[PDB]
């Protein structure tokens, strides 16, 4: 695989290398060159640069792009999305084609945000592409149903058992799994990081599986590492919450990094959960507060 | 399948669980029916605080939703079944704050004092406690918070209420008188002392003044101190006697009303916070406890349950 390169580094999350590499290879088939784009895209829609995708893409542009670029004004514009679902819902129903599997990962990511999981995962189904298997095995996670996570996991595991797609698949199942488990995650995120290189995102799962054991301060190295490099970065400041806390920090500091979170993403749905235990929790008080 | 969270909420009693699990009904119903906790309202920072570190986040692909983790106590052993939140607050962390609360009184940041103190008092309900004799001490330390609390309350009115009536003296010489039964340690205790010795002395109850100076020398407060009280002790030798009489005893057992500041002494009928241990007399009963001021006067309680040890089978 020539893209290799382009895809792995999409995959560990460093978005960057991939774009600068997706411009570098060069394109040797129609084909390639679509996929190319596709990831190249994808990469920009990981940085949250949706003007570059939705300017870029045109309706020229291949199919497998067009699904790219759906996903993006998805993501950027809240009001069109109930308008792209329902347009989804038909082109889904109304149109067999299988075949671009571009095309399914990302309605089933429209799906997946629009908090349909049974959709999403059924178009899931029909794709046959290793990141199917691996979009499908994370889905499955979310929905806590581990026993048919585990089942795809294999399934790809059968395929590729080296492919990185497989091993971050394993360390997801790994870290639901909980006990011994979480070692095995813990190293698979290290060993990547060790790789390719420290990404935000493999510094984060690395925390994730120190803190899931006791190991706090342990953590705190990686989170360290990860907010150097990007404040603002949402799982960052979310890991550090925590972490302070077990810590033993300050309550301000577990405050400044709720703060520093609002600022970089007021939207961000940790906020707004937040937000919303706040609301019921004024609810509740009024229910068991004595009447005046 | 099932969330992690929810497996929290039905594996444990504790409150601070399902805190972490972002269950609050379920946990203020569990600290209203364990403690007498009607009033939430001081309670939201640290419920939202303790909800926020419930769970980390992780991201499995990228352009996706983040994923959650939920760490767990048991790590370990616990299955997918029998997961239970990780710690996170200690027993050892409110006692250290103790000692903050400690140094704010004896500077005489009394009101700053009390904040820390009813702090700590709150936080103590939330805590996970491994072994027996901890939950002895998490009592102890609920206790420790109260009496400052009522006690040092009680000073700040004291020296609110006026000077002029001979009443008003008698009744501020009362209220000093009544602080000194309150269980501090030995360097407020001494401080108290000192204050109400001067009182008494002033009003010409001599009498009872010795006994203050006597039980302050005890102490073995800074020599400064001790040569004072000495001085002061052998002037009311000479004229030892009680001007005018108090509603004071200093031997009768007493029970410092939170609200009024009043005794009540040992059987008299008196109502008690299910949570802090504070006192009232029987007309706050059904209101909201001063001392606490989440609880309820009056409630019957389950009692706190701080450790798993506590339910049985």
């Known amino acids: 695989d020539e893209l290799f390169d382009v895809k792995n580094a999409f995959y560990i999350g460093s978005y960057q290398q991939c774009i600068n590499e997706a411009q570098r290879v060069k394109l040797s088939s129609p084909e390639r060159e679509v996929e190319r784009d596709v990831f190249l895209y994808r990469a920009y829609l990981a940085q ?27 993501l950027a514009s809240e009001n069109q999305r109930d308008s792209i679902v329902l347009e989804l819902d038909r082109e889904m129903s109304r149109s067999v084609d299988v075949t671009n599997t571009t095309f399914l990962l990302m309605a089933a990511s429209i799906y997946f945000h629009d908090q349909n999981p049974d959709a999403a995962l059924r178009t899931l189904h029909q794709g046959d592409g290793l990141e199917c298997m691996a979009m499908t095995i994370q889905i499955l996670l979310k929905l806590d149903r581990l026993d048919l996570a585990r089942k795809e996991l294999k399934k790809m595991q059968d395929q590729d058992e080296d492919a990185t797609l497989t091993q971050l698949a394993t360390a997801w199942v790994n870290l639901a799994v909980g006990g011994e488990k979480l070692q095995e995650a813990y190293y698979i995120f290290q060993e990547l990081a060790d790789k390719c290189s420290p990404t935000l995102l493999l510094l984060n799962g690395q925390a994730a599986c120190h803190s899931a054991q006791g190991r706090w301060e342990t953590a705190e190295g990686v989170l360290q590492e990860a907010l150097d490099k990007d404040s603002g970065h949402p799982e960052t400041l979310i890991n550090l919450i925590v972490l302070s806390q077990h810590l033993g920090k300050p ?3 577990t405050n ?12 961000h749905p940790f906020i707004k959960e937040y937000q919303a235990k706040e609301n019921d929790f004024d609810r509740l008080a009024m229910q ?5 | 399948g099932t ?12 409150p601070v669980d399902h805190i972490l699990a972002g269950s609050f009904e379920t946990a203020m119903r569990l600290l209203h029916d364990q403690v007498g906790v009607i009033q939430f309202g001081p309670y939201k920072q640290l419920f939202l605080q303790t909800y926020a570190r419930g769970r980390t986040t992780y991201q499995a692909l990228p352009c996706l939703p983040s994923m959650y983790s939920y760490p767990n106590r048991n790590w370990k052993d616990a299955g997918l079944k029998n997961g239970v939140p990780a710690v996170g607050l200690k027993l050892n962390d409110l006692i250290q704050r103790l000692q903050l609360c ?17 702090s700590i008092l709150l936080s103590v309900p939330l805590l996970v406690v491994d072994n027996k004799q901890e939950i002895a001490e998490a009592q102890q330390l609920i206790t420790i918070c109260r009496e400052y609390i009522v006690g040092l309350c009680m000073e700040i009115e004291r020296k609110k209420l006026p000077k002029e009536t001979l009443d008003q003296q008698k009744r501020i010489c009362e209220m000093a008188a009544y602080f000194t039964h309150s269980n501090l340690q030995p360097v407020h205790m001494i401080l108290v002392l000192r204050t109400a010795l001067n009182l008494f002395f002033k009003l010409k109850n001599f009498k009872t003044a010795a006994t203050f100076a006597r039980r302050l020398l005890e102490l073995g407060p800074k020599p400064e101190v001790a040569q004072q009280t000495r001085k002061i002790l052998s002037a009311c030798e000479k004229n030892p006697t009680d001007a005018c009489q108090l509603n004071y005893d200093m031997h009768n057992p007493f029970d410092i009303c939170a609200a009024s500041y009043r005794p009540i002494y040992r059987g008299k009928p008196v109502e008690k916070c299910p949570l802090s241990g504070a006192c009232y007399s029987p007309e706050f009963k059904g209101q909201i406890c001063r001392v606490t001021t989440v609880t309820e006067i009056g409630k019957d309680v389950i009692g706190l349950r701080i450790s798993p040890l506590q339910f049985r089978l």
């Open chain 1, 256 to 267: 400044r990094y709720l703060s520093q979170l609002k600022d970089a993403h007021r939207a």
């Open chain 2, 3 to 14: 969330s992690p969270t929810q497996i929290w909420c039905n594996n444990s009693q504790l």
């Open chain 1, 288 to 292: 068991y507060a004595p009447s005046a």
């Open chain 2, 102 to 118: 400690y140094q704010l009184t004896t500077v005489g940041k009394f009101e700053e004092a009390v904040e820390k103190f009813r």
């Open chain 1, 251 to 253: 309550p301000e500091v």
């Open chain 1, 48 to 74: 949250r640069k949706y003007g570059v995708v939705l300017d870029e893409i045109k309706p020229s542009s291949a199919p497998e792009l067009q699904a790219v670029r759906m996903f993006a004004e998805y």
